[model samples]
Target: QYYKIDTKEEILESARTLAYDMMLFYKGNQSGEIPGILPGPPTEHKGDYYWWEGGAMMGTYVDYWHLTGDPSYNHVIMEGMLHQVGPNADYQPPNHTASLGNDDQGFWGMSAMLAAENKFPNPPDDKPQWLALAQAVWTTQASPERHDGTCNGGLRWQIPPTNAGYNYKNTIANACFFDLGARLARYTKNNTYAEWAEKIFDWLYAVGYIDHETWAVYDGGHVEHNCTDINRAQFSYNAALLLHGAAFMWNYTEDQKWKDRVDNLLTGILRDFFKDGVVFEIPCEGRQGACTADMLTFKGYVHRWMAVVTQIAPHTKDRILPVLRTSAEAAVKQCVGPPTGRRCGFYWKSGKFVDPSVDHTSGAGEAMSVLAAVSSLLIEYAEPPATNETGISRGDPNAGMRSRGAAQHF
Candidate 1:
C-alpha cells in the first residue's frame, strides 16, 4: 500500500491555522481604543502592554498574511500598530510611557518597515506614515545624541539615561539597528541606509559584541565598565538579527563576504544555542527558575529571521531547513492539549507544561512563530526559480525596491 504525500501549501495552511490560534491567546480588547496586548492584562493572570512583545506579535501577523494571502491578518497588524504610532515622533507608544529603550522602538519600527515593504493595505487618513515612523526611529539611532564615544560609536541601550536599561549597551539594540538599516536600504534603494548598515556592523565587530573567530554574539557591554568585558551571553535572537541583516546585505551587494558571514553565524548559533536540535533561549536562562519573561519570547525572532535567510538565499536550504524543521517539530510535539486548545511547555523538550494555570504569551508566541517559520520555509523552498546570481527574482516581492538600486540620499 502507498501513502499519500502532503503538498507544501497544504502543510503551510495547517501551520497557519495553529499560528492563528496562538494569536488569539495574546489579543487584547477593551471598551475603548484599538485592541492589542496592553501593559495591563484584563484578566488577573497575565500582565498587559508589553511594547516589544506587541510589536513582535504584529510581526507574526505579517508572516500570517504573507503565508495565507489573507487581508484580515494584515488588518490586525495595521489596526494595532496605528494606535501605537506616537506619543511623539522620536518614540512610538500607545500612551505616555517614559524613558523608552532603543530596542523597544526598533521592534515597532521593524513591524512597520515590513508592512511598508510588503505593501500592506494603506492606513486611514489619520494614521501615521509607516515608512516615516520606521525612518524616524532609524534617524534617532543614528543621531549623535544616542551615540557616545564609548564602544566605538554603538547606540546606547536607552535613548535617555533615565530608562531602566540605561547603563547597558546590548546586542539586540544594535542588532535591531543593523536589521532596520539593511531592510530600509533594500526598501528605499538608498545607499545611505546601506552605509548605516555597514557602520552598525563595523561598530558591533569593533566593540567585541560579535566574536572575531567563532562569530558568536554576546548579550551586552556595561557602560559603567567603559564597554569592556563582554557579558558573554549567547541568545538566539542576537545571532538571528545579524544573520538577517547579513542576508539582506548579500542581496543588496551580491558580495561573497556577506554570505560567508551568514554561514558563520548560522553555524555558531546552531552549535551554541541548540540543545539536541531544538532551539533554546539560552541553556541556563531558559530552563526555569531564572528566565525572565522577555527571554521566553526570544525564539520567535530567531525563527522568523532564519526563515527569511532561507528565503533570500535558497542555496542554503539544505543547511537551514533541518534546523527549523527539527525545532518546529519538537515544538509541536511538546504542546499540552487538543488541537484548538493546545498550550505549550516552557521548554520545548519537556512534554508537560511547567505550570498548568499560567497562560503565558511568550510561550504561546513562540509556538505561533514556529508555525510561521515552517510556512515561510516551505514557501521559500517551493517558490519557482526567478532570480539570477544577483539574488533578484522576477515577480519577486522585493523586485521593485531592489531594481531601483542604492542611491545617495543623505
Candidate 2:
C-alpha cells in the first residue's frame, strides 16, 4: 500500500511523534515542579535549565496544544514559565557559559503564552508576568553587549562570552526575538515593541543577518570555523529561524520586502541546497559528499533546521519533506545507539553530523518533541490537502497556512 500520502498529514504525524518525545520527557518530569522533568541522565551541561531545554520543551507544548486541543501541554508550559518569573529566572544570554538569555527564550515563552491565551481566551493576570520575563530577555538582546552586528548578532552560544565564540551573532536568536516583540506588541499595545522589532531587524539587515540575495541568513560565523572568515557555512537552524522571522515581519508590516526575502530564502534553499529538489541537512561546501552530507548539529543539526523550517515553510513539501525525513531518520537510526532516550539533542563535527551517543542526554527526546510540535501546528494551522509550494507564499491558491509556517503562526 504505497499510496501517495497526504503531505501535510504525514508531516503532522511525524511531528506528533516528536511531540510525544517531548511529552515523554514531560512525563518523566511528572513531579509537577520546575525541574521535576529532567529527562535522561542529569548533566553538567548548562543547556539543561528552565530556559534552554525548557524553552524548547515549551515550544513542543504549544504546538501540542495548537494541534490536539490538549490543555495538558498548555498547563505544562504555563507552569514551567511561571516558575521562572521571579529573580531566580534564567538570565544568561547565548554565550560560552549559558545560552539561555537570548531571543529564543522569549520567543519560545511567547509561543507558550500566546497558545495559553488562545486556549483560555481570558488568560490569567499572571500571563503578563510570563510575557514580561520574556520581554526582559528580549530587551537585553537589543543592547550592544549581546548583538554587535557581527554576523551572529543577538545569538550567544556561550555565556560570560569568550572573545572566541562560534555562535556570537546568530540569525536564530534575533529572528526569534523579532517574533517575540511582535507578539508582545499585540498584548501590550506597545508599538514600541514593534518599533524595537524593526530596529533590531534593520540592524541585522544592515549587517549580514538578513541576506536578501540568498533569502537564507547565516546561522553563525565562528572565529574558529573557516579560519575566522566569520561569514562562512550557513547553519540550518539559523537559516530556519531567519526564514521564520522574515515571514513574521512580512505579515506584521504587510511589507513586500520581507515576503520577498522569504521567497528568496525558499528559492535559495531549493536551488542551492536541494538536489533534484531533495534537501540535505546542509548543502556542504560541495556536492561530493552527498550521502554523508551532514547539515545537522545534534546528529547533524538536521532536525533543528527541519523543525523551524517545517514551522516557517510548511508548504515546502515537494522540496523539503523528503530531505527532512531523510535527515531525521538518519539521525535517529544511524547516529543514535540502542534507545537510551538521552538529553543531548544535536551535535556537529568537521562540518559533518555525528549521531550523538548519550545515555541520558534527552537529545533524542528533544528531536521527537520538536517533530511533534511542528506536526501539531501544521494540523491546527494548515488547511486540508494542505501542502503548498512554498511555506512563505503570499497571494497563493492557499494562504491561511502561510502565516503558520513562518513563526508567522506564532
Candidate 3:
C-alpha cells in the first residue's frame, strides 16, 4: 500500500504554500482572495504584475482539486485563469513580441486545462473556447504552413526564424505542441489534437535525430545541436514537456508504439546523461558533444525530466528509480539550505555550487518543482509496486518498441 501519492496531495500542498507566499508578496500590489478566504488584489500595484503568474500558479490548485475533491483549489484555478482570459491578458494579446511565439501557447495550455478541468470536471467547461483563444495567438505567430510536416503543429518562440539568427526550429515550439495538444485531446476527446501532438513530436524527432542531407543520424542530432544562423540545441526542459505529453498519449490513445517510444527515450536519457547513477542535463547548443555542469538551470531540468520519466515509464522504475533518487540527492545538495528558504540560490559548476546573476521566481519555482518532483518520486516510484497497476501496465500490455515516429535516434 506504500505506492506513490505524487498526484494531487503533494502538488497541492506545495501549491497552497506557494500561494500563501504570493499572497504576502502581492499584498500591497494586489489584495484579494477566493470565495470564503480573505480578499486582496490579485495583482500588485507597486512593482510587478502577476496577471500571468496567477496563470502558472493555478497548476498546484488544480492538481489539489483532482486529488482531494476540494473546491478551494478549483476556485484558485478558475480565478487565476479566467482573470487573464480577456484579449488583453498576457498571452492572449494579439500583438506580442516577435520573440514570444509558441512558448505561451504550450505554457498557457497546461494552465488552461488544469484550471478549466478543476472548475468544471463533469461536462467540462468551455475549454475549446479558451483553447481557441490561446491557439489563435500561437498560430498567428508560428503556423503549420511554415513548419510543414517537419517540426510540429504549433507556433514558434523565436519568430522570423532569424531571432536565434538561425533558420531552424527551436525546442520551445515543439514543446508547445506536445504539451498543448495532449491536454486538448484530454478535454475534447478530439483525435485531431492528438494527431497534431504526435505529428509535432515526429517533426522534432526528425530534426533531432534524423538527417535530411545524409539520410543518417545527424552528428549533433542526439543533442539537437546545429547552427544554421544561431544554434538549435537540445534541452532537458523541452524534452521533459515533450515526454510529458507523450506519456499522456500512451494512456489516452492506448498506442503501444507511442508508449514504447517513451520507454526508449527514457532509456536514451539514461544512456546519454548518466554519470554514477545521476543524470546530467544536455545543452546541445552548437557543437557540444557531452554534458556541461551548471548545477542550476541546466541541472534542475535534468531532474524534472527524470521524475517525469519515471512516472510515465514505470517499468523502467526498477532500473532507473535508484538513479532518480541519486539525481534528486545530487540536485538538492546544490540548493541553498533551510532558513534561507527552500529555493535554489546557486548552481554547481564542475561539481561545486555557485551563484548566477539573475534570481527570479520562475527559477525558484523550477527548483521547487524539481524538489517536489523528487519528493514525489521517493514516495511514489522509489518503492516497489504494491498494485499490479504500476509501471507500463497503464498502457497496452504487449506494447512493443517503436521510435517516436518516423525518426531514429539510435
Candidate 4:
C-alpha cells in the first residue's frame, strides 16, 4: 500500500506504514539473536551484519518516535541501546569485542547522542544515561590510543589488533566521532568537545579523506601505506554526518569556519550524491551488487542529516528542505513489493519496487533506508533537537575518560 506524502497527516500515516513494514524485516528475539536485532539483509549475497546494525536501528526508532509521535518503539530503543553499553559503560560489550570497529561503536554512540539530543526518555538514575552513554563512547574513541600518529592521525577502521581492518584510517569512524563530539558540544556547551571535533576534521583533511578542494569525503586508507593510498569510494552517509556535525558547530559557536563547512560540504553533497533531487550512494547504487547491506541503509542518514541541518544551520532551509521534499516524493514511489504488503527498494530511479533481480534490491536495509527519507518530511513539524538550555537530559563530563575500553582491550 504505497501512500501519499502530500500533507503532514498523510506523511505521518505513510511513515507509520513504512515504520511498521520495516520492523517486519527485523528478526526480533529469535532463537539465538538478541531482542532488538535485525539480521543481515535478505539478498542472494547476504550481508555479514554484527552489532552495528542494531545500533543503526536504534537511531531509526528514535527518529520514527520523534517524527511520527509513536512511542511504540521507545522501549525497544531504550533497552537495546542499554544492553550494548557494556560492562565498562562504553559500547564495547564482551560479545562484540572481536568485531568492534570504532565506527561500529561510533554508530551506537551517535545513536545514544541522538537519543539525548531528542530527549528520548532517559534511563533510570542508575542505568547508563543517554548523554553519558554518548559521552562515554566519545571519551573512549577520543582517547590517545585511538587517535594515534600511525596514519599521522585519525581512528583506525577496526578496534582489536586481530581484526582485518585495524590498520586502516576510516572516515566513517572519525566522522561518527566528530558528529558525536559536535552534538555533545552543542547539547552541553562543552568547548572541549567542539575542539575535538575540529581536530578530527583537520586530521581527516590532512589525510585527504575529506578532500579539501572538492569537499568529498572518502572511504579510508591503510596505516601501512601511511594513509597515502586512499580509497576514494564516496558514500552519501559519510558526507551527510559530517555536514550535520559542521552545522552543529556553526550553531554552537556561530563560527564562520563551521558555517563555511556547512555550506561547502552540503553543496558538494548535493552536487555529487543527489541527481535530479534523488539521493544515490555514489560509486555503488544501481551497480549490480555494488552496495552492501551497510551501504543500502546509508541513504536514510543522508536524508536525516539534511533535515537536521536545516534546523541548526537555518540558512540552508530553502536549499535543504525542497531537495528533501523532492527526494521524499521520489523515495516513496519505490515502496511497492510483495502482493501482501508494500515494501521499499534501493533503486529509486526504477520508479517502482524492484523485484528479485539480483541487484541487491529489497531487504531490511533498503526498507530502512526509505523510512527516514519519508519520516524526516515531518521533522519540520516535530520539536527541534533539544539542547542543554532547553533539554532535561543529564550529562557526565567524565563518563568515558576512565574506561579506556578500546585502548585497554587491544
Tell me the alpha-carbon RMSD of every candidate.
6.5, 10.0, 10.6, 2.4
Q: Write the per-residue lDDT of candidate 2 for residues 3-58, one digit (tens) a residue.
A: 11246666555454445554664543455444323432233453333344555555
Candidates by TM-score, descending order: 4, 1, 2, 3
**TM-scores, one per candidate:** 0.83, 0.62, 0.60, 0.94
User: How do the residues 175-196 of candidate 3 rate in per-residue lDDT, one tens digit apiece?
Assistant: 6667666655654566766887
For each candidate, the alpha-carbon lDDT, in order, equals 0.67, 0.45, 0.44, 0.82
Clashes of each: 6, 46, 17, 0
- Provide the global lDDT of candidate 2 against the true structure: 0.45
Error of 4 at 240 (Å): 0.8
| Highest-scoring model, TM-score | 4
lDDT of 1 at 363: 54
Best by lDDT: 4
How do the residues 1-410 of candidate 4 rate in per-residue lDDT, one tens digit apiece?
36799898899898888888887766554566565456643332344455688789889889889888899878866877887788878888877666588889999998888898787999888888888888898888888777777877888888777788888888898999999989999888889999999999888888888898999989899988999999999988889989999999899989898899999999899899888988877788766577776788898889988898998899999999998888878778877677654666787855766653345444777777788899899978878889888776777867876654546655
